[PDB]
């Protein structure tokens, strides 16, 4: 979930 | 200056009449250059004054003056030594003041009774009644020595001054008096211990300053031994019971600290009556420092219980408290108890131990703080010699194995450490039967770190059972791994040979390990090929030179021709280090 480029 | 003495002086620096230190040690020699006559008239005087804080010098001077009774004329002249010592006693650096006292105490016995009264006691008063404090602080250490030899009328004087020292306006002089109350007590005749000591003791025990109270606990041990058991209850116990309840945890800390000493000094009856309850209260103190100090005393206290009805107070008055402490919050506390708890086995019996102690032993053995469980693990002996090796193996071994195979490799790593302990503590015969397997298993664990752990752990087992046990119980199973298809395991073998060369000695290495090493030089996997070079370079210095020419040098030269880069490099390196190049 950190940004879809990837948690 | 002048020359017989100017030798003591150091005319080369820039100080203030400072002395050559190495020379103040060659002091009892200048004492000969001039005779007794001139030692007294010129040497001592020169020493008395002329005191430039060189400390290291002042110290050697205080020590030296203690062994000068003869260089001055013998007993009839010891007092010639007082003046300079009195001086040093009232210095700054305590270390020196101490030495001064030790010496004054020493030569005290040289003074004739007549000279004590005539010269010694007077110095004691002047230090006691001194203005500055260090003077007073150091006076306290000089009462016990002169007290016995002087006259009835003078003793009294000595008691008065000592009294005045305990009630001194300063805490330090008071702590000092307190710390010497015991020895002074020990040399007065009963009646006076009852009439003068007790009151001083009572007073200091109820001191405004807890740094002073804290100290009356030790004085208590002494006064309590000097008195007949009947008088204890009236003259001491109330004061002692108060100390255990004292507002200051420091004071209570001291009671727990010197609990075993009080126990003996007070007798078994009072111990069952008064001390057992106090012990319970200390183990329940809100301050962890106190509980832990108290726990630390558990075994020693239980041993000293009247054989009479010992075993019953333990099960009824102590064991409960213990059960509580095993669950304590402070690991400082759990820690103290664990480092002595199983020592209760012999006192409680092989049956009581098994039904009551063994469970606690387990709790702590599976505690969080690996320190606490290590304390249990380092003290299995007495539990072992009490109950049987099997009755214990049956209560411990499940706990161990339980972890030797666990989730976290870190946890398993913890158990590998207990190995050389468990080993050398439960005996080789037990190790070959119930432990060896686990130790062999870890050699082939999935986690590298664990393998590495158990590898170097073999060395610590040989250091515990010897090169013979090794060649018969370990080298065999270890050498086997060289046939293993996994290279991670094949390398493990060489890693075990590398460490075992360190403690198996030139013979067992050359005959049983060197062969397997040399043989793997033709291993299909390059990582093994080069680690073999490295193993030769490791166990090389353990082999005699005939060996290093016959089969080592050849093998390495072969490897240097290997197709693999790293194998080449390590072979060359191996050679260049062994000198076989």
């Amino acid at each position: 979930x950190l940004x879809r480029x990837x948690x | 200056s002048l020359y017989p003495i100017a030798v003591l002086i150091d005319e080369l620096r820039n100080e203030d009449v400072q002395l050559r230190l190495n020379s103040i040690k060659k002091l009892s020699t200048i004492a000969l250059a001039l005779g007794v006559e001139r030692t007294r008239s010129e040497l001592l005087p020169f020493l008395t004054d002329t005191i430039y804080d060189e400390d290291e010098v002042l110290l050697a001077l205080a020590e030296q003056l203690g062994t000068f009774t003869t260089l001055v004329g013998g007993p009839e002249y010891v007092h010639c030594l007082l003046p300079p010592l009195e001086s040093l006693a009232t210095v700054e650096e305590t270390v020196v003041r101490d030495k001064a006292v030790e010496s004054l105490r020493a030569i005290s016995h040289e003074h004739s009774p007549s000279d004590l009264e005539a010269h010694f006691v007077p110095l004691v008063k002047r230090l006691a009644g001194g203005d500055w404090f260090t003077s007073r602080t150091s006076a306290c250490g000089l009462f016990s020595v002169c007290y016995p030899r002087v006259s009835s009328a003078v003793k009294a004087e000595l008691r008065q001054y000592f009294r005045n020292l305990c009630s001194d306006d300063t805490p330090m002089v008071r702590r000092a008096a307190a710390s010497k109350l015991g020895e002074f007590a020990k040399v007065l005749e009963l009646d006076n211990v009852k009439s003068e000591i007790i009151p001083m003791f009572s007073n200091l025990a109820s001191d405004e300053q807890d740094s002073v109270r804290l100290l009356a606990v030790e004085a208590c041990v002494n006064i309590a031994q000097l008195l007949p058991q009947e008088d204890l209850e009236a003259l001491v116990m109330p004061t002692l019971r108060q100390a255990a309840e004292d507002k200051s945890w420091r004071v209570r800390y001291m009671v727990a600290d010197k609990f075993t000493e009080l126990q003996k000094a007070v007798g078994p009856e009072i111990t069952k009556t008064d001390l057992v309850p106090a012990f319970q209260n200390l183990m329940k103190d809100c301050e962890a420092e106190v509980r832990a100090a108290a726990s630390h005393k558990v075994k020693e206290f239980c041993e000293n219980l009247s054989a009479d009805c010992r075993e019953n107070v333990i099960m009824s008055q102590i064991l409960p408290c213990i059960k509580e402490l095993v669950s304590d919050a402070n690991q400082h506390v759990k820690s103290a108890l664990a480092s002595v708890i199983m020592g209760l086995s012999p006192i409680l019996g092989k049956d009581n131990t098994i039904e009551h102690l063994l469970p606690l032993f387990l709790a702590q053995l599976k505690d969080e703080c690996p320190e606490v469980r290590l304390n249990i693990i380092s003290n299995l002996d007495c539990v072992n010699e009490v109950i049987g090796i099997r009755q214990l193996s049956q209560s411990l071994l499940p706990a161990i194995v339980e972890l030797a195979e666990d989730a976290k490799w870190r946890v398993r790593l913890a158990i590998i450490e207990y190995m050389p302990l468990l080993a050398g503590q439960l005996g080789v015969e037990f190790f070959d039967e119930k432990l060896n397997s686990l130790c062999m298993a870890w050699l082939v664990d999935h986690v590298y770190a664990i393998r590495e752990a158990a590898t170097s752990n073999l060395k610590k087992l040989v250091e515990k059972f010897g090169k013979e046990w090794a060649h018969a119980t370990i080298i065999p199973k270890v050498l086997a791994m060289s046939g293993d298809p996994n290279y991670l395991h094949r390398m493990t073998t060489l890693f075990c040979i590398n460490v075992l060369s360190e403690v198996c000695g030139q013979d067992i290495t050359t005959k049983h390990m060197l062969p397997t090493v040399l043989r793997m030089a033709g291993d299909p996997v390059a990582n093994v090929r080069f680690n073999v070079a490295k193993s030769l370079q490791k166990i090389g210095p353990i082999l005699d030179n005939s060996t290093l020419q016959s089969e080592v040098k050849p093998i390495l030269e072969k490897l240097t021709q290997d197709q693999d880069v790293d194998v080449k490099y390590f072979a060359q390196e191996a050679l260049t280090v062994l000198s076989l190049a």
Binding site: L2, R4, X6 | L488, N527
Partner: protein, 288 residues
Amino acid sequence: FTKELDQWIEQLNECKQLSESQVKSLCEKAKEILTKESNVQEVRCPVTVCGDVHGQFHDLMELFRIGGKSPDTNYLFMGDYVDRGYYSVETVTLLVALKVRYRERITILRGNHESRQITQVYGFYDECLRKYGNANVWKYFTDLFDYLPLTALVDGQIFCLHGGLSPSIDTLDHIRALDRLQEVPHEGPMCDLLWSDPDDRGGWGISPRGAGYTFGQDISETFNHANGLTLVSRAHQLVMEGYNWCHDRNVVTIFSAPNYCYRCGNQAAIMELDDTLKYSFLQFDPAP
């Protein structure tokens, strides 16, 4: 020189960066060594295959604790050495260092993060500015990344690459036919290998990342059969369990950065391929 590398390595193992001077050098030779290797690097087992590391230096040290130390243990990293973690510089430099010291003990592949564009958005760029004082070390490493092999083949049976399969590549020759010496493109075969993701919808799909594609089981089966592969080994995707099987075991995901970005709470894993291509996984939490 060898004595020097050993030094640099010992240093880097204490998590101490090397100088700009030494990076420039370390990089110039690493280029030499890496040019000779191919888009489909041949790797002989035994070897341990690891996934993403992303500057999590201290977890990398935990990884060596678990699989053995280089050069004793052979290693194959499938890229993604930088960004996210707090120590991309120490990490990447150590690995490149190991590769220059031990060409045959380690193989390092290229991941989607071994690129100039994404390193300027996800860490590695700024960290370099912070640790050195200009963009030089970044330039050296990003240039070096261009020589990083796109794929590795272990014993002609196990195919390893950072991301995944490409609808514009069905043959290992196709891959050997690409020019890898260039920044990773936004699309195409080279891009797809480093950006695609296995999936549970059949055939090809739209990549939710904006690069490469998703591919279902049927696709892998075909790619494997056509190339004589026993299984496809990739990374690039956080997998809570550290490692993950899919496509009826034609594909396996291996993520080597535990508790990724120090926020997701995933395990990390590492795959051991022994002397016989027999595979075993080692899962591990973050080092304390």
